[PDB]
């Protein structure tokens, strides 16, 4: 569509005034580039916390997967979007989503050292024992990077 | 010197020869090319990483070069870009005036020892140092018609055989291919490679052994056994000739005994080095040769040399190959000199006719038909001798010039004929005394001109390059012709004229002659009666010239601003941008739509169209593209309707239809070197290591704020790409250790396929040319097909990609910028409707200002241009004013009298200000050069009025009013023939609608308009102003 | 002498010798210079704050000041007084030892997992019919 | 510690070092000052 | 080194000689090829 | 060798002319310079 491809791009610039007025024209709030991502998968990337309220608001999928199956609570959680993590996750965001490779946003979070996100997901039942492809769980990652805070929390 | 030369004719032709085989001579050895070096020097490093994307090429090439760029003389600024398709640009921009040679020489020199630092494979394609401010003199397009030869095929057949011959051609300076010559293309296939237990590593190694040039020796090689009788030179392995020993290539020898060659696990055939430019013109599979002017070259010669050997190679041209001129230079330079010839050829014929008109004589009609092309020819000679080249600036400053030629020329034979219809003197007496009242007046105004013409040409950068091309020409033809004046018009006058009698004004002859001899004279008595009584009230008139001085100010300031004028080029450009990830078949789809307008709705117009998928000047891709229209003959386009800006409008307009695509058409820039030249160039810097994402969100509010001022600015965008989604794949390090495969193994396997691989070069048919080894097609689109590529462990047993391997999607710049070693975005605008750049600028600065912590700028280009140019006007204008007063104060002998004479220049610039504003041009150079000739002349007028008033004032004892009236009487004929003459002269310019148009009609409406204001009112002004400042002071 | 065909002439001959020489010494970076023995002058740069060490502020001078004033024209050669940072990898014998390792292991080891691969494009040229993807392919980056 | 290029001017490239310190002062992190404890170029300029 | 003058004028002279285009002031340019592997390209130009 | 043989008629030439038209600057003649110029082949057939 048009207007999908604008909302797209306005989710992503987080133009919130623009995404205002293609919720009121009926831009497709399930547009998808090639990737796969939707307006929601982007927002949540760039860290537009408003645009993915006005996006959920207007039947945006919450559990909307990419071509290689991450969803927009995995992007929430990896780049440390506290307040956005949580929006999703009220809105019914699958907290033990696994992508093609069986990584959780549990995994992501614990990766990049999110301590508050971590601490939010497992609040929301996180699966703590949860194995990616290679059989590693947060803890696993937590361990290797050295992060003695992280360490702790999942314990 | 006037009375030295009237007694000593022959002397005075001698010197007139001399001057004119100077310059028939300097006519033979005198450089030709359509513009001199305007842009500052510029030297561009260009290196290549096969498979490598922005930020792999960025901080293992880019950075570590930056880094080594020290020690170099004379760097203004230093700006860079990498991008996904492997490839980074250095261009280090000069200071003007520095030696090119010396300034590559030294960039050159910091990167050699810089070599060791990059990648082995980036070492392996090498890194090119070339001096990228040069231009092109003309595009060799090669296309084959029959559909026999690809793309591919087409360009190593002009490598192998064209290329160097138009490189050897006489006047050529550089020669760059529109493509590649063939590479022997592995494209490897992972079920096969896998079937063998066989890796890309294995390939690689193989064809390394198996195609090598090995060194042996020599029997009975020094130091011998004693007796030995023969010596011969041992040969051992040398390099693969063709696709079939490279078939025969061994990998594997199964247990069975059966062998395992390149041939069974790949598909081997000639092809490209990349794949990523496809080339069409017309539809058809295309290549071309970017010719370059050489140092002092004749452009027309070049040219005529490059068709020549083109014409030779013809007839061993396979069937179906073709040469066409998509972009060629020299039709502009050819017209430019044409149209000069032709309007100093009508310059002649145009006074020789006034001249008969009012002297009515061929005796005095022949001797401004020897002095001009005198002076022409010497100004060539002084052209030559300082440097400089026959070119379109040089070829209409010699065109401005002939206004102030014909003027001297005149006005020392109609002041010679007068004195003899007055005073009743012979010939030789007459002129004696003639040349004794304008000797010290011609002088004086020969260093006024200079005041004017001369601090002009000492701007800086790029404008000042332009200015000096003119200042150099006018100040040359006005020196020159002033000592042509002082030698041999005086000689040719006291020798070639013939008596007049006393009080014989041509009223006691008949017919034509004897009445307009009749009006004129009755004409005499009627102006010199309108002075009487505009001197009466010269209160009123004062007045009259306060309200020219304003009107003046008030059009100069709305009258819109441009440096040079948009030509009809008979070429210009439709960029196509595509949406992020589009790929090439997508961006050809839209490139054929392009094409099949411009051949079916301008069919009259368009000659072909070059359609180029991969390649954009804001950035590169599969997603980018650029069709170079080439138009028919101007002659065979007539209207407005079949021009560039016409056909422009129409293709923006019907592209605009387009879905999923950014299509639009542009003239190029009125000088390709120097780029656009219309608007800002802005450097948005990280001074504090921010990161590319928060540069980005920096850059997005400099834009947000610039788009909520609309008043001031426009189009502000920025110049790069913007970021797009990249399949970020991780390799389990325990994983690959656990399963015993290395990690060169893996990423060789990934690099080599997926990127491509340079492993090492063979000979085809006596010529050197890459091996690439990479992945079939099929095996290497969509993240599906990463899964089929095994690599062997150390245990011997084949492990899939997936099995060692994660992947997920971020986003990333498909092309980052550097500017001064630091990261940059560089963003590009323009001021409003009625505002100026430098205000635009102003506001732009006021906007970077309140930007996060950490975030810089600075001006680069064209604004770093205009910036340092707009610090010397100033100062430059002041010096100008102040040594005018100075000559015309020591002409005059008098702080007073010199102002008389300055209070004209406003009469010539309304006149100019007028036809511009009517006929809807812009404020441009040709138009500022057209101002300082037509303030010159109207000047010239006025100092000879000055003069005569001042003299018969000091000399005879006349008063103030009676000098006056007596002066414009003796006056008013020699102004209104010199004026009559060059608005003709300058009429063909103006209504000119063909080749070059856009600069003729620049020089001539401003020149033309001047003119007519500067005669009419100079006329009954300058009376007015002698007398207004003499009663004033004393 | 032209002090700039002096130096052009100096490194021509220069270049037939850096082959010859160890690698370690090549990237190291050979430099030729036309400038004085003596110092022009000294531009020092303190912390009036305490907030920056010795060591943090050799860092930033070398980082984000020493080139632009390499860069500038006139400036011959430029003294970095102190050291621009580098990744220290200070090794222990006594555990390199107990795991059976030498310093050739580390070496190998952060060649092999520091390094920026070119991993080509996914749709990447020349490409198959009715391909609608394409991507840049990211690999091993530096480590920061 | 800042050498001479051959034959280059010693007023004329301090006053260019100068003015590219003077671009990078505005983007210092707080504390961080320069200072001026060696410099034979004033000499020159005063001297004349 | 190791090259015949036929490998060494493919691979190294004509490779050169190819790229000596554009040089000012060049009157003629001469080359040989040996079995030492060796190749000197010599450049005459104009006097002055 | 050449080069100097085919340039040797146009330097001929180029002088003769530049000694003639000096003449006729100095004696204020074409007439005296002719009546000069016309002993140069008497010189010449001497030379040869
Ligand atoms: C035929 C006789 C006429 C001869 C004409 C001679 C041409 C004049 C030679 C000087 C040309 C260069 O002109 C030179 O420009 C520089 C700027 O770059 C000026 O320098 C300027 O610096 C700053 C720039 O913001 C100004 O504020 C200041 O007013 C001015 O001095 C010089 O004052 C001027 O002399
Ligand atoms: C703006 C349009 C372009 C026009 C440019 C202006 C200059 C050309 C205009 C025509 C000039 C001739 O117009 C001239 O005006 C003056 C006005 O003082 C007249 O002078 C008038 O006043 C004086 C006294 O003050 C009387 O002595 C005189 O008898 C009377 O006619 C002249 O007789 C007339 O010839
Ligand atoms: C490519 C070369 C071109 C330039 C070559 C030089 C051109 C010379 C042309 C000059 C001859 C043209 C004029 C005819 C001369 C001529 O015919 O000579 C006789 C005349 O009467 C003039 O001489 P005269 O009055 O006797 O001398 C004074 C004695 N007191």
């Given at each position: 569509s048009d207007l999908g491809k604008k909302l797209l791009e306005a989710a992503r610039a987080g133009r919130d005034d623009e995404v205002r007025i293609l919720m009121a024209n009926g831009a497709d709030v399930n547009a998808a580039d090639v990737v796969g991502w939707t307006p929601l998968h982007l927002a949540a990337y760039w860290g537009h916390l408003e645009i993915v309220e006005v996006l959920l608001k207007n039947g945006a999928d919450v559990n909307a997967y990419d071509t290689l199956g991450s969803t927009p609570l995995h992007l929430a959680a990896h780049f440390g979007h506290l307040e956005i993590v949580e929006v999703l996750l009220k809105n019914g965001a699958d907290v033990n989503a696994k992508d093609d490779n069986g990584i959780t946003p549990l995994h992501l979070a614990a990766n990049r050292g999110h301590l508050e996100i971590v601490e939010v997901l497992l609040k929301y039942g996180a699966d703590v024992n949860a194995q990616d492809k290679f059989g590693k769980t947060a803890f696993d990652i937590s361990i290797n990077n050295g992060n003695e805070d992280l360490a702790e929390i999942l314990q | 010197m006037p009375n030295f030369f009237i007694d000593r004719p022959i002397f005075a032709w001698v010197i007139a020869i001399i001057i004119m085989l100077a310059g028939g001579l300097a006519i033979l050895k005198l450089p030709v090319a359509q513009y001199p070096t305007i842009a500052p020097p510029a030297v561009t490093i260009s290196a290549s990483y096969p498979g490598a994307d922005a930020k792999t090429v960025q901080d293992t090439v880019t950075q570590v070069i930056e880094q080594n760029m020290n020690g170099i003389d004379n760097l203004m600024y230093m700006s860079s870009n990498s991008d996904s398709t492997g490839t980074v640009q250095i261009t280090l921009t000069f200071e003007s005036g520095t030696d090119a040679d010396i300034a590559q020489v030294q960039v050159q020199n910091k990167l050699q020892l810089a070599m060791p630092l990059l990648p082995q494979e980036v070492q392996q394609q090498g890194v090119s140092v070339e001096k990228s401010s040069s231009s092109f003199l003309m595009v060799v397009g090669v296309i084959n018609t029959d559909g026999t030869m690809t793309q591919e095929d087409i360009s190593d057949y002009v490598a192998a055989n064209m290329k160097d011959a138009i490189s050897r051609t006489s006047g050529v300076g550089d020669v760059q291919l529109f493509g590649s010559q063939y590479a022997m293309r592995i494209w490897m296939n992972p079920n096969e490679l896998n079937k063998f237990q066989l890796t890309p590593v294995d390939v690689i190694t193989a064809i390394k052994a198996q195609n090598a040039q090995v060194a042996a020796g020599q029997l009975g090689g020094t130091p011998p056994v004693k007796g030995q009788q023969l010596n011969a030179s041992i040969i051992a392995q040398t390099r693969l000739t063709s696709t079939e020993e490279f078939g025969k290539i061994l990998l594997k020898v199964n247990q069975d005994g059966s062998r395992v060659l390149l041939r069974d696990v790949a598909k081997i055939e000639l092809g490209g080095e990349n794949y990523d430019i496809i080339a069409e013109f017309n539809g058809q599979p295309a290549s071309g040769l970017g010719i370059k002017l050489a140092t002092g070259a004749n452009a027309l010669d070049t040219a005529a040399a490059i068709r020549a050997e083109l014409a030779k190679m013809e007839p061993f041209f396979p069937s179906g190959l073709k040469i066409v001129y998509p972009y060629d230079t020299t039709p502009f330079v050819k017209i430019s000199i044409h149209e000069v010839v032709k309007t100093l050829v009508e310059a002649i014929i145009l006074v020789f006719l006034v001249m008969y008109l009012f002297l009515q004589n061929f005796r005095a009609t022949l001797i401004p038909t020897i002095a001009v092309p005198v002076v022409l020819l010497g100004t060539f000679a002084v052209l030559a001798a300082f440097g400089f080249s026959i070119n379109t600036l040089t070829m209409f400053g010699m065109?401005?010039?002939?206004?102030?030629?014909?003027?001297?020329?005149?006005?020392?034979?109609?002041?010679?004929?007068?004195?003899?219809?007055?005073?009743?003197?012979?010939?030789?007496?007459?002129?004696?005394?003639?040349?004794?009242?304008?000797?010290?007046?011609?002088?004086?105004?020969?260093?006024?001109?200079?005041?004017?013409?001369?601090?002009?040409?000492?701007?800086?950068?790029?404008?000042?390059?332009?200015?000096?091309?003119?200042?150099?020409?006018?100040?040359?033809?006005?020196?020159?012709?002033?000592?042509?004046?002082?030698?041999?018009?005086?000689?040719?006058?006291?020798?070639?004229?013939?008596?007049?009698?006393?009080?014989?004004?041509?009223?006691?002859?008949?017919?034509?002659?004897?009445?307009?001899?009749?009006?004129?004279?009755?004409?005499?008595?009627?102006?010199?009666?309108?002075?009487?009584?505009?001197?009466?009230?010269?209160?009123?008139?004062?007045?009259?010239?306060?309200?020219?001085?304003?009107?003046?100010?008030?059009?100069?300031?709305?009258?819109?601003?441009?440096?040079?004028?948009?030509?009809?080029?008979?070429?210009?450009?439709?960029?196509?941008?595509?949406?992020?990830?589009?790929?090439?078949?997508?961006?050809?789809?839209?490139?054929?739509?392009?094409?099949?307008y411009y051949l079916t709705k301008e069919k009259n117009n368009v000659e072909s169209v070059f359609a180029v998928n991969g390649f954009g000047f804001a950035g590169r891709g599969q997603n980018t593209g650029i069709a170079f229209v080439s138009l028919k003959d101007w002659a065979d386009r007539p209207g407005e309707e079949?021009?560039?800006?016409?056909?422009?409008?129409?293709?923006?307009?019907?592209?605009?239809?387009?879905?999923?695509?950014?299509?639009?058409?542009?003239?190029?820039?009125?000088?390709?070197?120097?780029?656009?030249?219309?608007?800002?160039?802005?450097?948005?810097?990280?001074?504090?290591?921010?990161?590319?994402?928060?540069?980005?969100?920096?850059?997005?509010?400099?834009?947000?704020?610039?788009?909520?001022?609309?008043?001031?600015?426009?189009?502000?965008?920025?110049?790069?790409?913007?970021?797009?989604?990249?399949?970020?794949?991780?390799?389990?390090?325990?994983?690959?250790?656990?399963?015993?495969?290395?990690?060169?193994?893996?990423?060789?396997?990934?690099?080599?396929?997926?990127?491509?691989?340079?492993?090492?070069?063979?000979?085809?048919?006596?010529?050197?040319?890459?091996?690439?080894?990479?992945?079939?097609?099929?095996?290497?689109?969509?993240?599906?097909?990463?899964?089929?590529?095994?690599?062997?462990?150390?245990?011997?047993?084949?492990?899939?990609?997936?099995?060692?391997?994660?992947?997920?999607?971020?986003?990333?710049?498909?092309?980052?910028?550097?500017?001064?070693?630091?990261?940059?975005?560089?963003?590009?605008?323009?001021?409003?409707?009625?505002?100026?750049?430098?205000?635009?600028?102003?506001?732009?600065?006021?906007?970077?200002?309140?930007?996060?912590?950490?975030?810089?700028?600075?001006?680069?280009?064209?604004?770093?241009?205009?910036?340092?140019?707009?610090?010397?006007?100033?100062?430059?204008?002041?010096?100008?004013?102040?040594?005018?007063?100075?000559?015309?104060?020591?002409?005059?002998?008098?702080?007073?009298?010199?102002?008389?004479?300055?209070?004209?220049?406003?009469?010539?610039?309304?006149?100019?200000?007028?036809?511009?504003?009517?006929?809807?041009?812009?404020?441009?150079?040709?138009?500022?050069?057209?101002?300082?000739?037509?303030?010159?002349?109207?000047?010239?007028?006025?100092?000879?009025?000055?003069?005569?008033?001042?003299?018969?004032?000091?000399?005879?004892?006349?008063?103030?009013?009676?000098?006056?009236?007596?002066?414009?009487?003796?006056?008013?004929?020699?102004?209104?023939?010199?004026?009559?003459?060059?608005?003709?002269?300058?009429?063909?310019?103006?209504?000119?609608?063909?080749?070059?148009?856009?600069?003729?009609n620049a020089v001539g409406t401003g020149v033309m308009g001047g003119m007519v204001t500067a005669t009419v009112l100079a006329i009954f002004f300058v009376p007015v102003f002698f007398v207004v400042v003499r009663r004033r002071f004393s």
């Open positions: - | 065109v401005l010039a002939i206004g102030l030629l014909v003027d001297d020329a005149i006005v020392v034979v109609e002041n010679v004929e007068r004195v003899m219809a007055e005073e009743g003197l012979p010939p030789k007496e007459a002129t004696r005394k003639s040349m004794g009242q304008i000797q010290g007046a011609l002088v004086g105004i020969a260093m006024v001109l200079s005041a004017v013409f001369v601090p002009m040409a000492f701007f800086g950068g790029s404008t000042g390059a332009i200015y000096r091309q003119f200042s150099i020409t006018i100040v040359s033809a006005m020196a020159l012709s002033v000592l042509v004046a002082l030698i041999l018009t005086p000689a040719l006058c006291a020798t070639m004229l013939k008596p007049i009698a006393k009080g014989d004004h041509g009223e006691g002859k008949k017919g034509f002659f004897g009445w307009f001899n009749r009006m004129f004279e009755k004409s005499t008595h009627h102006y010199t009666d309108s002075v009487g009584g505009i001197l009466r009230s010269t209160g009123r008139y004062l007045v009259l010239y306060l309200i020219i001085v304003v009107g003046m100010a008030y059009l100069f300031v709305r009258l819109p601003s441009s440096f040079l004028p948009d030509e009809d080029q008979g070429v210009f450009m439709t960029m196509v941008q595509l949406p992020a990830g589009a790929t090439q078949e997508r961006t050809q789809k839209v490139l054929n739509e392009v094409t099949h079949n021009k560039v800006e016409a056909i422009t409008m129409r293709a923006t307009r019907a592209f605009s239809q387009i879905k999923d695509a950014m299509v639009f058409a542009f003239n190029l820039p009125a000088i390709v070197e120097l780029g656009t030249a219309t608007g800002f160039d802005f450097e948005l810097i990280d001074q504090a290591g921010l990161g590319h994402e928060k540069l980005t969100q920096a850059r997005n509010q400099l834009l947000a704020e610039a788009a909520k001022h609309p008043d001031m600015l426009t189009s502000v965008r920025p110049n790069g790409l913007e970021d797009t989604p990249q399949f970020k794949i991780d390799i389990d390090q325990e994983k690959a250790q656990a399963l015993g495969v290395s990690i060169n193994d893996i990423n060789t396997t990934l690099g080599a396929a997926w990127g491509g691989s340079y492993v090492n070069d063979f000979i085809d048919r006596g010529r050197v040319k890459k091996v690439y080894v990479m992945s079939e097609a099929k095996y290497r689109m969509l993240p599906d097909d990463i899964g089929d590529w095994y690599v062997r462990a150390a245990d011997g047993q084949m492990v899939p990609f997936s099995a060692f391997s994660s992947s997920r999607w971020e986003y990333g710049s498909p092309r980052l910028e550097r500017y001064n070693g630091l990261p940059s975005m560089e963003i590009l605008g323009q001021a409003a409707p009625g505002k100026s750049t430098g205000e635009a600028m102003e506001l732009m600065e006021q906007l970077a200002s309140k930007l996060p912590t950490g975030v810089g700028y600075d001006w680069t280009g064209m604004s770093y241009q205009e910036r340092l140019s707009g610090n010397q006007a100033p100062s430059l204008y002041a010096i100008s004013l102040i040594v005018v007063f100075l000559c015309l104060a020591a002409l005059y002998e008098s702080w007073s009298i010199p102002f008389s004479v300055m209070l004209v220049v406003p009469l010539g610039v309304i006149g100019a200000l007028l036809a511009a504003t009517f006929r809807g041009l812009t404020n441009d150079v040709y138009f500022q050069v057209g101002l300082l000739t037509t303030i010159g002349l109207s000047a010239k007028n006025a100092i000879l009025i000055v003069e005569f008033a001042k003299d018969l004032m000091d000399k005879e004892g006349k008063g103030l009013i009676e000098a006056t009236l007596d002066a414009v009487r003796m006056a008013l004929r020699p102004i209104l023939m010199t004026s009559l003459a060059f608005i003709l002269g300058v009429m063909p310019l103006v209504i000119s609608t063909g080749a070059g148009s856009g600069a003729q």
